[PDB]
Each structure stands twice: as structure tokens, then as C-alpha cells.
Design an enzyme around this catalytic site. Structure first.
Site, mmCIF file in Angstrom:
data_model
loop_
_atom_site.group_PDB
_atom_site.id
_atom_site.type_symbol
_atom_site.label_atom_id
_atom_site.label_comp_id
_atom_site.label_asym_id
_atom_site.label_seq_id
_atom_site.Cartn_x
_atom_site.Cartn_y
_atom_site.Cartn_z
ATOM 1 N N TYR A 60 33.431 12.561 -9.140
ATOM 2 C CA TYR A 60 32.623 13.768 -9.226
ATOM 3 C C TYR A 60 31.249 13.397 -9.773
ATOM 4 O O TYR A 60 31.143 12.928 -10.912
ATOM 5 C CB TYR A 60 33.245 14.820 -10.140
ATOM 6 C CG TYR A 60 33.325 16.168 -9.471
ATOM 7 C CD1 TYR A 60 34.346 16.445 -8.579
ATOM 8 C CD2 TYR A 60 32.291 17.110 -9.614
ATOM 9 C CE1 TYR A 60 34.413 17.658 -7.935
ATOM 10 C CE2 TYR A 60 32.335 18.332 -8.954
ATOM 11 C CZ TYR A 60 33.403 18.593 -8.102
ATOM 12 O OH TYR A 60 33.504 19.788 -7.431
ATOM 13 N N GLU A 62 28.138 15.675 -9.585
ATOM 14 C CA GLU A 62 27.153 16.751 -9.483
ATOM 15 C C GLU A 62 25.850 16.341 -10.165
ATOM 16 O O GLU A 62 25.856 15.783 -11.265
ATOM 17 C CB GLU A 62 27.697 18.039 -10.106
ATOM 18 C CG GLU A 62 29.063 18.459 -9.569
ATOM 19 C CD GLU A 62 29.625 19.687 -10.239
ATOM 20 O OE1 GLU A 62 30.110 19.576 -11.391
ATOM 21 O OE2 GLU A 62 29.608 20.761 -9.595
ATOM 22 N N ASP A 216 14.745 20.232 13.161
ATOM 23 C CA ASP A 216 16.164 19.893 13.112
ATOM 24 C C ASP A 216 16.426 18.853 14.209
ATOM 25 O O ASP A 216 16.573 19.205 15.380
ATOM 26 C CB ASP A 216 16.997 21.166 13.298
ATOM 27 C CG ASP A 216 18.507 20.947 13.107
ATOM 28 O OD1 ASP A 216 18.977 19.798 13.174
ATOM 29 O OD2 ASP A 216 19.231 21.937 12.896
ATOM 30 N N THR A 242 21.921 16.152 11.136
ATOM 31 C CA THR A 242 23.226 15.535 10.977
ATOM 32 C C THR A 242 23.076 14.026 10.932
ATOM 33 O O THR A 242 22.031 13.457 11.261
ATOM 34 C CB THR A 242 24.138 15.857 12.147
ATOM 35 O OG1 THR A 242 23.487 15.442 13.362
ATOM 36 C CG2 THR A 242 24.405 17.320 12.182
ATOM 37 N N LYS A 245 26.510 12.342 15.687
ATOM 38 C CA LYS A 245 25.775 12.573 16.930
ATOM 39 C C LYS A 245 25.111 11.270 17.278
ATOM 40 O O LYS A 245 25.759 10.241 17.164
ATOM 41 C CB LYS A 245 24.831 13.751 16.781
ATOM 42 C CG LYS A 245 25.652 14.995 16.401
ATOM 43 C CD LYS A 245 24.800 16.272 16.574
ATOM 44 C CE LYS A 245 25.580 17.521 16.083
ATOM 45 N NZ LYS A 245 24.926 18.758 16.531
ATOM 46 N N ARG A 251 30.101 12.302 9.492
ATOM 47 C CA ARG A 251 29.696 13.699 9.543
ATOM 48 C C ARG A 251 29.100 14.054 8.198
ATOM 49 O O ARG A 251 29.811 14.080 7.186
ATOM 50 C CB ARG A 251 30.886 14.590 9.875
ATOM 51 C CG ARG A 251 31.248 14.510 11.328
ATOM 52 C CD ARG A 251 32.375 15.465 11.725
ATOM 53 N NE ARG A 251 32.751 15.132 13.093
ATOM 54 C CZ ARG A 251 32.167 15.631 14.169
ATOM 55 N NH1 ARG A 251 31.367 16.683 14.091
ATOM 56 N NH2 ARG A 251 32.383 15.053 15.349
#
Lengths: 461, 462, 461, 462
Positions: A60, A62, A216, A242, A245, A251
Site C-alpha cells: 500500500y 497512497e 487522449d 491507456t 492497446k 492495463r
């Protein structure tokens, strides 16, 4: 009594979960024994996959590197710093002029985070219409006014469209809309547009109406990295993407932003802290550090000379695929392609995209129906990245065109014989002998090439 | 001029393709098993989960639902996701007629924001447990100066409810009063640093009294809920959202549970199903992360096993045994104990801040996090049991963990008493400290005495 | 053929519209032959009425004096300048420290304009709860969450309440609410509160949470002008008001705002241009210049020594009215009054406000039912301005108390005899001999005093 | 120490109580009848209207509706308002089963904003005629820089439609295209400076095509609508709002008309009535202005008389006769004429701005206002016929008005040619100008030759 750690925690998937194991084997077989033409799909590397399935999922973190809530992030910081610096390198960005945040869970979270960062709720956004080749996250409402995309729920969106007769973006109508509507934000980039983007023109439109300009580039990001299409960074304020692709990564998403001094008052860009804060704490929780490690792998691969040749080959494969289709009399929107996809107009043949998509699907050729000229949709979208990742070159793609040619003519035989309506068309798919044959030597063709991500000399099937 | 062969770029292992990243993952693997992980939101998932997570499932676009996808070729993705949905219902003892689940949220925060989007309009009022009182950012948060921090507070109107400032328990009467003035459309329960169970019955009564939907965010205690070791939110809540890592011990992902079928008393039925799904896709997310959905389906079958029920009982007992150990030394915990997986340690009666204790703990590879106390610099630390229980630790091992923490806070006071209360002074006691180094050494040695899930210690680079 | 101007345009109302003429005569009779206790009502002067019905209704003057769209505003400018300067004088405001806009059509438009000026949509507002004595325009939603007031439709409102056992504003709970809720704006002032306002305390609460502080003094504005209650100007940022009610003017509104240098950075107040702009062009069209002329008359009257004695007499009449009611054992919220009204708690007598209101109404005593202690409503609101404008003093108001006493006891006789439920209670009003008698010597009492606005020695009835 | 007797403060006339204000009203009365009022939104109402307006009706609080009031004592206020409602329906030839009206809006802008609030949620999309193309502020307006000016654009989302930039007519095709992209929930028609009638049929077809409500704001032409001299919006619009002054010749107030009863093609009925009323009160307004409602009921009975039908015909003919006079001199009007009460005069072919002409016109007591032309410094002036027609002027008198305007624009060019195009130079030609003063004198003398409604010229102070 608890299970020993060795029993539940180190035992391989094939033994802990035969059901799920088995489904992944079947899915692995499906992926290398058909023809993948979904332009948003690719096949990523084993190295990427190994970082993605790693103990990095257990941490974790954050916050930002050097600015975390929890301790123990010594090595996670270096993984993310390295991923952010590899992201600037892969796109040829000077670090004093560009920053990146690599924590978005995926492309759509990267878009919504960017919006949150620079817009207040209900601010106006313009994006390429969905029917003209744009994406859900650029704004979509129905003709009845139901707000579909969250971009349209929480902001005010108005789409711009392609020219209905050339299929190119209508830059004059884009400017007229922008001057009436006065969006705070203009989005470029798209999902089913088969040409490059005039970012200099979008930048002049944005300056004329006082809008931020965001590109984008999810679909073409691998082409952008190999400098095979126009660079949005040259003219845009923010670039989202992304990382799968055409980039061939995991991903995930990325938000790029301008840093440093503005062009001509005498002030500097304000994006960096607003974007990091938008991602965390505003919208996301802990970053998925296995994604970030996997992306850092993908970005290194994306800088290599091999990847520059891949993206070059993605374009020439799409060109040759479309060159071959037009050679048979078929119609492509704009009459060619400049990127990784072609858009096939099937309305001259009296067919809808649904029909071709369904029949191709029965032969393990995956395409998707797509609206044409901003208009049941009249075309199919066909992309080159996935099959090019398996080492297919022009002649192999011309052969894929032959399969599509065979597929569409059988789709016409069924329509001539059974009826124009969908329910009628379906009758010609029940135990169709000729569909079985095309599925056969499609499957034999696909069996002829290699496959990244796993060794086919190892799969259960 | 040449394309890299598929074997070269595509099949080569990470250790050859990317030695830097390989090295860092190897280093991170050693950090994870040579220290004592006590972050209450941390866990160590299984090798089976990891194998599904890093798999060819990342290659499939499957926007939409099983049986209603945008693209073809989802023959097996549909079966993985259906099996994931049905295992999520089975692991929480839910009848498929009364409850449904969506397993596409990318993480816990996307799960929450999609649940909000499904059932609320922009600017609808939400109430959630105050961050300072143990809540989560995604339940609402704005600062005293008015700055909206949480997205939930940016696109909706939030107002927090707090713990009783002297007992540390949720103030259910003040919750009812705020909810009747504010009239939220949604009341959220569940939290990050709350050390007791939840009175969902009472939350239901408040929700019914003011006309709100009731949602539980069970991220921290989802493992305890699946094992039926804490109160079930499903008995009283309309919607239940969760992470799938943390005490559930799965991948990083999210789930939204929603009621289905006939409502209790007119003759209407629950309207949640379609709105939730539509909110995840197409409103908010793109393609699902099918490798996470596979890893999650693995984790959910594991969570239904008898060993996981015993792991959950053991987590609760290690927290209790660690807490009783601390109060045996004169330390104070908020509410005087725990009913779940964590304890909240009030350090203010020792004149210490959570920062000072968290920093020195970190320098011995004991990971805790500083934490606000009694809704109030943060004056506590948060200590969780899931991660170390996953490594096989039992009550006596957590009493030994309480021993090292006791040593930690003693060394922390010594340094404060010698060098001073300012942080700049405090740091002076952390350089060349043979007592810290003896505790770091003692933590490492104690830590190496237990197995580790997810990978084989016999294979590490370090 | 058009009508001559003399026929349609100069002919008096009594000849052009006998129907409407006749209704105004009847309404004129109703106004001087009953007892008016609605605390938001008054009887204005003939001079005010003459300005109000004047050719000033014919001029369009969108804009500010000296800053109009249309020409020909030479005399309209002087009327409005004079009205704005008379507004500052009447409230003892230094022109370098206070400005006023006198164009709001009425009190509620003055409130919504002020909100528009200093708030963005959905900003948080706190106002005195409706059930605790506040006004609709301070925010109101139902227990089901239906947004009733436009203040609650377009902003986010949360009410503060009186102490449920003393009936006084709960200043400690006002502060606790304000610190949780963090409103951009706190409203004080009210409609059914029978005590003065601790503006110093509201100002300390506002500073503590970072809120603007607005007082809506519509009910007590005449008392404020005569310096008979606490001045909100001493502690508030903005003050809004009607100009009728206790000010005895026409129906209109005013927004007062701080000008000049702030108290302790080193900057100045920002309200003047935001407020003028909010009124026009944002919200209103042309000002109603006959209202502005009439208000300028009312404000001059409001500065006179006679008006200072009126407001003094309004308070002492309310005190004596309540002193007399408590003398009969009746209960008043807070046990007295500091302003123009009393709030009678009827729940100790087992009655609801509806019942007393309906019976009083049958005797031409006008009061309204009102909720008590922030709680069918348990009280009636009774005000002194209207009857004091007809020259009633303490003994006359003690006699009004006697009528109310007679009214409530007859309301109890009917409830004892017919039933607690409303439908039962109604049975005792059909041809009630004793109600007729009280209506009789109420009407004879009201006939004993003068009447402003028109000569009763001239009315049709 | 003493209260002023009622006779002294309360019954004394304004001329004694407030000599300053009396003097100013007297001065304003003379300005109104010694000049030529050509502001298209201006009129001179009747003495009957004024007598109801200045009356004891200002003393009554009557929040609510007739028969559902908050307070008692509304016996006669209810009858005045009911008679006002029924006269509003009769004056516009509406069946009480198909149409309802609310006559409490304080003015035209409150009428519009309450209609919006009734049928829209905050941020719903509205389309209205662009301000620059002849629309009104309350239909939506933001500047090129994005600043939201109109309240309508602050609390809702507006987007304007424009005139064809070369013909000056509403571009109905571009309206249909914008409305299909934007998908407003409400389309507004009607305007302030539009010189032609409205194709409501076509607006209905656009509204039906995109799923919008259709509202006409008929403020400028309400008198012509009541007299059936322009197209009826009631035949095609869901809601119709209006001022009651201007060409209706009443007090300053507003009305909201709304359809009632069965909808045309399922089986539903119109839902407007309750939402409209509730929006006026309690959502937006306080007590009604009962003196305005009385004055309005007077004005509406006058508007139903045969003389008002003839006044309306005459207004249209005076505008037409004034326009033909101007184009007889070579002047240009937008769209080449008028179909209603005003003409729009394009001054750009003379090299003049509307400011220069409006200022010199003002110095002769000719009140026009400068106005944008063809959706485009403002390059036209707006000239209305209602006010001077109310004083009895007919076609030949408006040809004389066109004569003075011709003289005005000639003197304006002379001054531009002599002193220059900058405004600072232009002003130099307006001091000691015996030709301006001869025109001011000629306007005054011409102006005094006609009667004046609302008060008696034989009683003025001046």
C-alpha cells in the site's frame, strides 16, 4: 486450525483452482488460434506479465514517491520514479517541460482524474462524437438527453463531428461549435478515427475560445512513442492515455502535463499539483504497484529500436490490409489510413456491421461493428496491433484481407438467400458448411505464427 | 530495420528483459518478509491469486456484461466473470435471488464512486464516518477551511458523523440527529481505523427514519464478514462495497453488492441491479481488468474454504492478544480493546505523537501508521493483524510483536527525554543507536522464523 | 378607430372598471373595520400610495443612476439617488462604509439577488429554521427531502433552530452546526422570533467558520431604523429587507452592503459591484420606478421624529398585549417580547393554532397559526405594527388582548362541546351566536380609530 | 415624545409630505409628454390602471393562491385575483380548460425565472434567441470570455440561436441543428428587438424533434397577441410568459400562461399547473403585489376592448409607415420592414454608430436606443411605436416622426464630417447648435399637439 502457508499460499493455481486455471488455458488457446482485429487489443510481453503478477500487489503506497502515507516504500518509490522517468523518455519529453502521473488504474480513470484536476463540476467539455469515432469518456448523451458517460453526468459535454461526406474531422465546424459553446476543455484523440490529428489546428481553436486542450492518445500511443504519428505533446496542455492497446503494456493509465514556463502574463503552468492531487487523494486509493512495475517494463520496451519497428509495421500492415480491401472494390472511410486501423464502410454492399461482425466471429476473426461518417452501424473497425505483435507482416495482412473478403461474400450469400432483416440473416448461420471451412483455414493460418506472453509449447490445449 | 522476434521481446523473462525492475521486485520481496508488516490495510495474497493476476487475461477487452458484451470472443471471459460473481455471493452467504454483485470495479475507490453514481444525482447529500474518527477518504472529506478533498465531496454534498470524543465509539445518537437535519440521500457505514463492530441494525433504523439508502463499505473487514466473524452488513444494508485485498486476501480490485428482488414493507422491488452495472460500464469504466477478475475469483474460492474461516478467527484473536499485551504494559487503546482486525493505540497519555513512534518503528522494519484518536498532530498509531497472521503468526507471536512495540515506544521516549520534543531534535536519537539496531536485528530474526505466501523464499534473489 | 386618449387613458377607475373599483372599496372597508394582527402587515401612508400610483410606472431605466441603457432618465436618476441616500440616512449608515441597492422588486428578490451576488450555485447557507421562526427564503426542505425554497433548490441549506425548551436561538448549537457544515453564508433575522438578535455572537460564529453574515431584517426594519432593536449593520456584511412591514413603506426590497476598508490582508470590501450586477443585469429587468419613488417617500417618513415614536409605541403595545395575555395565564414563547410581535403557545390549553386562527378570523381579527419551540402548529403569531399605525396605544392593545381572551375561551367552549378534531371543531362555528357578538363589538372597536392611506370619510362603504 | 396623528403622516398628500419627490414626479410627467418616446419597450398606461396600482391593495399579505392562502382576510383579494386570472385568459382567447395563468410574478424577469424553476432542474439546458440577434437577457447570456451574465445562464445551461447574418431573419435551419446537438430541455422563442413575427409552428416541430418544452416570451408583442394582430404562440407553445406593461399597456408585472388538460398524441395530461404556481410561491416569491394584480386586471379588461384592438392595428401601421418613410430616404432597416411594433434601423451603411444617433436624438427629446444589427459598437437603433400611438398618433404623425429622425441623422453626419469619428470629437458638435435647438424646439412643439394618458395635462406643475 489455519492451513500451513505452503498449502494455501505457495501452491500453484493449477492445483488451488482447477476451474479458473482451465479457463485461462482455454482463453490462452482462443488468443493464438484465431485472428485478432480489435484495434484496441494487443498481446503484451511475458516480462510485463511477470511484473504484473508479482508481490508488488501486496504494498500500500497512497501518496507520491517521497511523499507517502505509509512507511516501507523504499523500493516502491524507485519503481514509480523509474516508471515516470521511463514514461517521459518513451515520449521524448523534457522533464522541465512535462510531468506524468502513472497511478491511474486505467484509461477512463485517467480521463476522469484529469477532468477533476482542471475543471469544476458542470464545466463544458467538447470531445469527438461517439458516432464520429470518439470515446465514451469524451462525453455521451442520448437523443433523449439521458446522460450516459460520467463525463456528461458531472460535466457539460457537447460533441464535434466528422464531415459527413469525407469522414475527416470538420475543423471549421469544430471551431464554430467551440465559439458558441465556449468549453473550458477540448478533447482530441479518438477510438475509431483512421487518420492523424491536426493538433496545431486544435491548438488554434483552443486559443480562440479560451479552452484547455487535452489529447487522449490511448489508441495511437504506441505510434506516438515511435514518432510515427503527429505528437500531441507539441500542442496540447494535457495528454492522457491507456498503456495497453498499441503501447503493448499492461492495463493502466497515465496523465501527462505541461510543467515550467508558459508560452506568451509571464507566468508558469499550474497542472502538476492539481493532477497528482486529483488522482490522490481525490479519486483513487492505493496505486496498483504491480501495474506500475509492469508499465515501467512496457515503457522500457517501448523505447527500444524493436518497438519503433513494430509501430512502423503496424501502419504498413493496416495500409496493406486496406489497400487490399479497396482492391476488391470495398470502401474505407477517408479511403485509406494513417494509423493502426481501417474503418470499412459496408453500406455500399447493403450490409450492416452487426452482420459481418457476427459471421467473422463465427470464424474466430474478431472485429467490431462501427458507425460511419458520424451517422444499425454501417461499418466494421479493423486494427493491426494485435496480429502485428505476433509477427505478421504485409503479405500475412493481405491474407487476412482475403479472409475478410471471403467472410463478407458469404455474408452476402446469406443475405441474398435468407433476407435483409437480422432475424432472417441468422437462419443462414445454423450449420453453415462454408462458415465451418473458413473457420478451419482461419484457425490453420493463425496457428502458423508465434505468440508473446506465454509459451505455446506449454499450454494445456 | 527489423522487428524483434516474438521470442526475444515477448517470451523472454523479466529478469533478462528488465533487470532493474526485476532487481527492485526482488528487493521488495525481501522487505516484505524480513520485517513485521502491521499496516491494518495490508495483506499477503496467495501464489494462486498472483498466477491468475499475471496471466494472458490482461489481453482481452470485454466491455459490458457476461452475455451482453460489445466485442466477440468473450466465450471464456464470460465464464470466469460469472464464476467470480457466483463465488462472491457464496463467500458472503447471500441468496442469488436477494443479492447481486458487480466485480468489475478496478479498486475499492472506483467501487464506491460507481455505487454513488448509480443511486445518486450530482450534489445529493451523503453522510459518512469522519476521516478523523476512522472513516475513509471516499466517504467524504473537506478540511476546516472548506476545501473539498474527496471526489465524493467534490461531486456530492457530504457531511461527516464522528465518534463519541471520550469513549471512542460511534455516536449513534448524534448520527441520528445529524441525519435528520441534513437528510442525506445516502448514509455510508464502515471505516478504516475503527476498532469495533458496527450496529447495522441501528444504521438501518436511522436510514429508515430519514429516508436514506444505506451502504456499507466493508473493505477493512471483508475477510471477517465472509468468515461470519463480525456482524453482517448484508442483513441491513441496501448496497455493500468492498476492496478485495486487505482482510479478504485477494487481488487489488473492488466489488459492489446490491439487493435484488422484493422489498420488505408497496409491492415494489429493488431497483439497484441495472443502475449499478450501468454505472460501472459505460458511465465510469472502460474494459474490465480480466486478470484481476480471475485473481479475484481465485481469492473468493479460497475465502470460502475452512482454513480461511480459521485464518479470520485467528486474525481477531491476534489483535485481541496484541491489545491485551499492550494494556498489560499500561498502554491505552481507543475503546479499550478490539472486536476486529486492528487496535488503535492512544499515545497521548505518553506525551508522544504517532509520527515519532511510526518513524522509529519503521527504522526497525515494523510498519505501522500514525492515526487520529477519538475524532480529534496525530496522537495514535494503527496496528493491524491480517498480514502477519497470513504468515502463520498466532497469539504468542503477536505477544512477541507487542514486546517489540513496547521496546519501540520505550526507545522513543528515551530519545524524546534526551534530545527533545521537536522533530528536529528527535531525529538525533536515531543515528548510530545500538539499541535500535539490536531491535531491528531482533525484528529481522523474529521475522525470518515464518513462511511467506505468494512466492517461494527458497527462490529469492536476496 | 382608436378611442380618444381622454376616454381610455384619463377616465377614472370607478368608471373604467366598476368591478375592480368596487372590490377595492370593499377591501378598504375590510382593512379599517377589523383588527389586523398579522405581524408582517402595516398600513402605509397616502403620500407613499400617491408616488406608487404615478407616471413613474411608465419609465424604463435598466442599469444604475448615471449608468443606464436608455436615455431620458434625468429625473429618474435623481429619484433613485435620493432614495439610496435616504436609505443610508434612515439606518444611520456612513456612505463610505455602506451602500444600498433599492431596485429589488420585493424582499424575496432582494434575498435571492444577494445570494446570487456572493455565492456560487450549490454553496452552503445556514438560516433560521422555518419551524423556529425563520423565513422560506432562508432555506426550506421537507422531511422527505423535497426542496421547497428556491434557496434550497439552487443552494445547499441547513437550518439552525431555537432551544426547544426556552424558545431562544441556540447559539451553541448554531456554532456546532456551522463548524460541521461550513456554510459560505449565515443568515440571521426571522419572521416569528419574539426577541432581539445577538449579532455580535453571529459575527463571532461567522468568523470562526469563514462565513459571510447576512441579516434579513424585513420584520424589524422599522424598529432598526428607530434604533429600538440591535443594529445588524454593526456586525453583518450584508443586510436585506422588505420596505413594507414595520418600515411602513411600499412593497419593495433593499440590499445594504459594506463598502470601503475591511477590519483585520490590508484590503477592501468587494460587495458593491457584485450586488448591483446581481440585481441587474443578472436577475431583474427594469426597476419599478414608482416603487422606488414611493420607497423614497417612506424612507423620509422613516427618519422623522414621529416614526421614532411609532416604533417605540409598536414595542410597548406588543409588551402590553403580552403582559395582558400572560395576566390571564396564557403562555408566550420566551415569556415576553423585545420587538413588534408576541408568539402565543396554545398547547398548554390543549388547542392548535388553526382553531384559534379560524375563529378569530370569523370576528375580523387576523392572526396566523405558528409553530412553537422549533417543533399541527401549537401557537399564533400576533403583531402590533398595523394597529399601531392606526393610533392604538397600550390600553387599546390591552383591549385587543381582551378580544383574544374572549376568542380563545369560545374556542375552548366549542372544543369541549364538539370534539378535539378539526372536523368536529368546525361544527361549533355554524351559526354560533357568541361568535357573532364578538365580531360585532370587534367591528365597533375597530371603527373607533383613524386610518392612513385613504380618507374613510370618502369610501364607498 | 408624541406619535404623529394619523391625519398628519398618513392622510396628508405627497405634495406636502415629500415636496422633493413630488417635484421630481411632476418634472418626470413633463418629460414624458414634451418629447417623443420611441423606446420599443415603453408605453403610457391609463389613469384607471394607475388608480388601482396606487391603492390600499398594497396593504394586504396574501401569500398562496385564491382559496388556499396562508392568512385569513383575503375575501376580496381572492376575487380580484380570480377576476384577473379569468380576464387574462379572455384577453388572449384561451379556453379555461386548455390554459391556465399565474398573475403573481412581480415583473417579466421573475415570470421567466419562475417558469424555468417550475419545469427545469438546475443546470438543465436552455436555448434562446441570442442577445445580439434581438433576444432578452433572461433567455440566456454569457460573453465571449465565458462570464455568465444572465441568471438563466448562472443556474441553467444556455446556448443561443441567432439570426441569419445577411437577411436578419431567424435562422430556423441553424436553430434545428443546434437544438439537435445541444438537446435543450427548454427552447425559448420571443425577443426584444426582433422586427418580424415568429414561426411558432416551426419552433414546435424543432421542439418535438429534440424533445424540448417550448416557451414563448411574448413581452414585447403581448398587446399585438391579445389583439390577434401577430401569430398566436398559444397555438404551439407549452408555456407563455409576458410582461404586462409595454404593448399590453398595463402595470409593471408578469404572467405565466401554461397549458392544462389532455395532451395531443399516452392518454396523459399536462403537468404544468401545480409546478408553475408552486414555483412562484413558495419557491421564489413572497406576498403578491395585490395592487399590481388589481392594476393588471384593469389593464386586461381594457385590453379586451374594441379600442385596444384598434390601438394594436394602429401600432403596427405606425411602425410600417415610419419604416417606409425611412427607406424612402435611403435608410436601411434589418429585414427591410416590420411585421410588429418596432423597426430596426441599420446605420452602418451611413458610417454611424447607434450611440452617436441615440445621443443626438436624446438632446432633442427623442428617445430611441442603440441596438446590435444582424446578430453582430452597436450599429443600429431600435424604434418602437406603442408609446406615441397611445398618445393618439397615426400614420402621418409617424411620418413626421420619421422626418425628425431624418433631420437627426443628417445633423449627426454633419457633426461627424466636421469634428470626426471619435466620440470625443463628436460631442463638440452638440454644444450651442441652433440646428439641434431648432429640432428640439420642433419636437417639443410637435409633441405638445397630442393628449396624454395616466394624468391630466391641465393639472401638471409644469
Amino acid at each position: 486450525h489455519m492451513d500451513p502457508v505452503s498449502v494455501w499460499g505457495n501452491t500453484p493455481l493449477a492445483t488451488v483452482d482447477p476451474e479458473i486455471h482451465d479457463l485461462i488455458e482455454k482463453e490462452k488457446r482462443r488468443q493464438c488460434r484465431g485472428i485478432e482485429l480489435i484495434a484496441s487489443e494487443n498481446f503484451t510481453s511475458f516480462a510485463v506479465i511477470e511484473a504484473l503478477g508479482s508481490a508488488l500487489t501486496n504494498k500500500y503506497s497512497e501518496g507520491m514517491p517521497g511523499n507517502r502515507y505509509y512507511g516501507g516504500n523504499e523500493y516502491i518509490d524507485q519503481i514509480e520514479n523509474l516508471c515516470r522517468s521511463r514514461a517521459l523518455q518513451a515520449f521524448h519529453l523534457d522533464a522541465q517541460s512535462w510531468g506524468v502521473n502513472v497511478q491511474p488504474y486505467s484509461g477512463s480513470p485517467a480521463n476522469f482524474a484529469a477532468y477533476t484536476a482542471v475543471l469544476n463540476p458542470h464545466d463544458r467539455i467538447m470531445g469527438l462524437d461517439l458516432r464520429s469515432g470518439g470515446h465514451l469518456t469524451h462525453g455521451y448523451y442520448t437523443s433523449g438527453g439521458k446522460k450516459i458517460s460520467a463525463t456528461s453526468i458531472y460535466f457539460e459535454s457537447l460533441p464535434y463531428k466528422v464531415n459527413s461526406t469525407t469522414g475527416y474531422i470538420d475543423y471549421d465546424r469544430l471551431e464554430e461549435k467551440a465559439l458558441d459553446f465556449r468549453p473550458k476543455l477540448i478533447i482530441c484523440g479518438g477510438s475509431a478515427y483512421p487518420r492523424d490529428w491536426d493538433y496545431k489546428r486544435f491548438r488554434e481553436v483552443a486559443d480562440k475560445c479560451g479552452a484547455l486542450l487535452l489529447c487522449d492518445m490511448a489508441h495511437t500511443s504506441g505510434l506516438v512513442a515511435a514518432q510515427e504519428v503527429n505528437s500531441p505533446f507539441e500542442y496540447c496542455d494535457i495528454v492522457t492515455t491507456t498503456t495497453h492497446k498499441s503501447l503493448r503494456g499492461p492495463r493502466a493509465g497515465m496523465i501527462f502535463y505541461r510543467k515550467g514556463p508558459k508560452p506568451p502574463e509571464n507566468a508558469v503552468y499550474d497542472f502538476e499539483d492539481k493532477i497528482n492531487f486529483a488522482v490522490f487523494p481525490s479519486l483513487q486509493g492505493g496505486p496498483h504497484n504491480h501495474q506500475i512495475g509492469a508499465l515501467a517494463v512496457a515503457l522500457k520496451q517501448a523505447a527500444s529500436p524493436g518497438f519503433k519497428a513494430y509501430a512502423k509495421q503496424v501502419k504498413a500492415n493496416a495500409v496493406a490490409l486496406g489497400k487490399y480491401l479497396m482492391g476488391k472494390g470495398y470502401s474505407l472511410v477517408t479511403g485509406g489510413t494513417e494509423n493502426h486501423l481501417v474503418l470499412w464502410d459496408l453500406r455500399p454492399l447493403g450490409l450492416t456491421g452487426n452482420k459481418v461482425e457476427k459471421l467473422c466471429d463465427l470464424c474466430n476473426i474478431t472485429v467490431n461493428k462501427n458507425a460511419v461518417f458520424g451517422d444499425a452501424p454501417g461499418g466494421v473497425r479493423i486494427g493491426a496491433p494485435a496480429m502485428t505483435s505476433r509477427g505478421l507482416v504485409e503479405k500475412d495482412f493481405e491474407q487476412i484481407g482475403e479472409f475478410l473478403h471471403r467472410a463478407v461474400t458469404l455474408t452476402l450469400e446469406i443475405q441474398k438467400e435468407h433476407g435483409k432483416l437480422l432475424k432472417d440473416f441468422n437462419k443462414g448461420l445454423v450449420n453453415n458448411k462454408a462458415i465451418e471451412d473458413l473457420k478451419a483455414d482461419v484457425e490453420k493460418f493463425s496457428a502458423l505464427f508465434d505468440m508473446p506472453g506465454f509459451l505455446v509449447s506449454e499450454m494445456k490445449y
